[PDB]
Amino acid sequence: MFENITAAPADPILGLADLFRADERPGKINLGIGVYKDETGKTPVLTSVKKAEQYLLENETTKNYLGIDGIPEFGRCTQELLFGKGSALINDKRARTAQTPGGTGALRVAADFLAKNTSVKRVWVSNPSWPNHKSVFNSAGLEVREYAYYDAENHTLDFDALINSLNEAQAGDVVLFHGCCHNPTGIDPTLEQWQTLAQLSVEKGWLPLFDFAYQGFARGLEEDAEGLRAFAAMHKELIVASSYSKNFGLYNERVGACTLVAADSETVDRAFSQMKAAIRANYSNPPAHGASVVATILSNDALRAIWEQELTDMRQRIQRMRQLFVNTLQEKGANRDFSFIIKQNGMFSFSGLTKEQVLRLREEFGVYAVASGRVNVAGMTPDNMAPLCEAIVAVL
Template identity: 50%
Template sequence: MFETLQPAPADKILALIGLYRNDPRPGKVDLGVGVYKDIDGKTPVMRAVREAEKQLLATQDTKTYLGLAGDTGFNAAMTKLTFGDKADLSRIRAAQAPGGSGALRLVAELLQRTRPGATVWLSDPTWPNHPPVMRAAGLEVRNYPYFDAASGSVRFDEMLATLRTANSGDAVLLHGCCHNPTGANLDLDQWAKVADVLLERGLLPFVDIAYQGFGEGLDVDAAGLRLLAGRVPELVVASSCSKNFAVYRDRVGAAMIMAKDGAQADVAMSQMLAAARALYSMPPDHGAAAVRMVLEDAGLRKDWETELEEMRLRMLRLRVAFAEALRRQSNSDRFDFVASHRGMFSRLGLTEAQVERLRTEHAVYMVGDSRINVAGLPEDGMDDLAKAIVSVLD
């Protein structure tokens, strides 16, 4: 019966993993998939996570089921990490999910159960997996303008103008920090203006926070989300531990609901867990248990925060060095925005054909829309890389 099927198109980001791996050229540069890399190009297990895993191995005496919401200690710790210590926890519920994508899908399923076929507004551009995840749950996808490629900044007025045309009950997906793929983010004044429009139009904010700690720091990166939580009646969140705990393949994330009151939060949570039961039943335990141990233990937590901060500062240094190299090699300020962006990504504004030439002629890998993973920038080869980029510009 499979003779009727056409092959599925390859995922634009994940396809780069294999292409890069199979490239025999020495000095190849991987700016593709969003994983943190150290100066040696390695993606290490974080110290605190490794220690928690050791303790877990030594103390775990059963692997029996935990339940649909997974590890409740993890959920409580993630709620605090995301919403902060001052949040009104009585109307927030969280469910452990298989990674950020799993969390997005759970929230999308909840929206579908709340308003079948509801519209979710996504930034243009956004992470390429957002539309398929939303559509898989049955939601309609529309876009709001977000990025001005020429200046590397947010098209904020157009974003707000478009959101003002949204209908009451629509959801608006906002990147909590470290916008993927552009690296251009809202400041707090802009978050406040977004909150005004959400309230004015009766829109539901849906915050995807997958890079907390990679932009300006753990608390600052959640400040926009927390501002919204203080102003709007309802909010849904998908968070990921893939990057900030470097537990990518263990699939650790959380889906969170802030409802008008505790009773409504309980009902919404029951619907979200029913969706989980039909999708995968229960989330994988190991990574979330390690994350919970790190967050609950003062010593492990301090070490994790220190290492995360080192990673963040390294990405900032790389941004500055890369922008300087591009300025030298292009003799222009065209790419200066790279230094002021935050998070793991920036979008350089190259054409697909230029990106392809970089790969074939220079063994430089980036996503087709010219998104670069800043953590992959070669500390000792910035000028060579900048020269290669400038060489494909004309």
């Protein structure tokens, strides 16, 4: 049965972990996978998370199954983060949330739900985007088409090209938007651009699907949700796939949410029952530990204050690394303008390196980035910055 199976191609991102660690030389520097590092080059457990875990250890009395949609408090807290306390969507009970294994899990549940219960056949994704978007949607039987996004000359959002691209999208197509911290470009729509896009998607009959993996890493929790909320104010229906992997540092505990919004309570409840059916036939019900940590923190004033400051600390350290990166590149070498790196949002910079320059960085210098030229600024430290920048200057 298996003797004729062809090997899968290497994953453009996760496969870097394989190449790394297999690399035996001491000075190697990992700027690949999007995981936060502190100033010592480690990815620690958040202190708020350790405190929540101690509370769960001391107070959990059962591991009995959650409902298919997970912990109710987790869903309520998620909807408040997305839409705002006092939101009309929440008051009118227009939103239902399923706790999922990660943001990836939420994207797949959305895709399965859409493929089986609607007329959706196509998802529009930005060029460039996260490489696993195409994989998730294709796996559900949906085709993926690309829209223009990035002006590489000016390092801006090519808004006119984006709009003209999406003219080929038909009513009933899904359009995927990154909520904030675009992966890989770090360039987000302005509020006015979000507002224009919200209006256009209504008029064109697109179903918005938000991928919201970095809330809090651009400007702040409320600020980063402005685009989503502009869409929520205009649309009867949308889907949000959100992740707590980065902003709680809970990567391996698989903590995400799929939030379904419809015109009214009766409709969203009926539609959500089919989302739950899609979950039941996938992994049955979701993993409690990570989501319980998130719910415990978000619903407690003390823990939430600790966590919000830890998230602020992460955001500010990345911003400090952006500036140090630009300054150190000017030292040690070029003689080219990298000021655009300072304005980018999130953990990545899309640095202008070619595929071959990235290969050379890996092979010659032990500096690891993604072939797209994406580098993880959150992986930079005061200690590794000089060798990193010396390496980049060497490859031009």
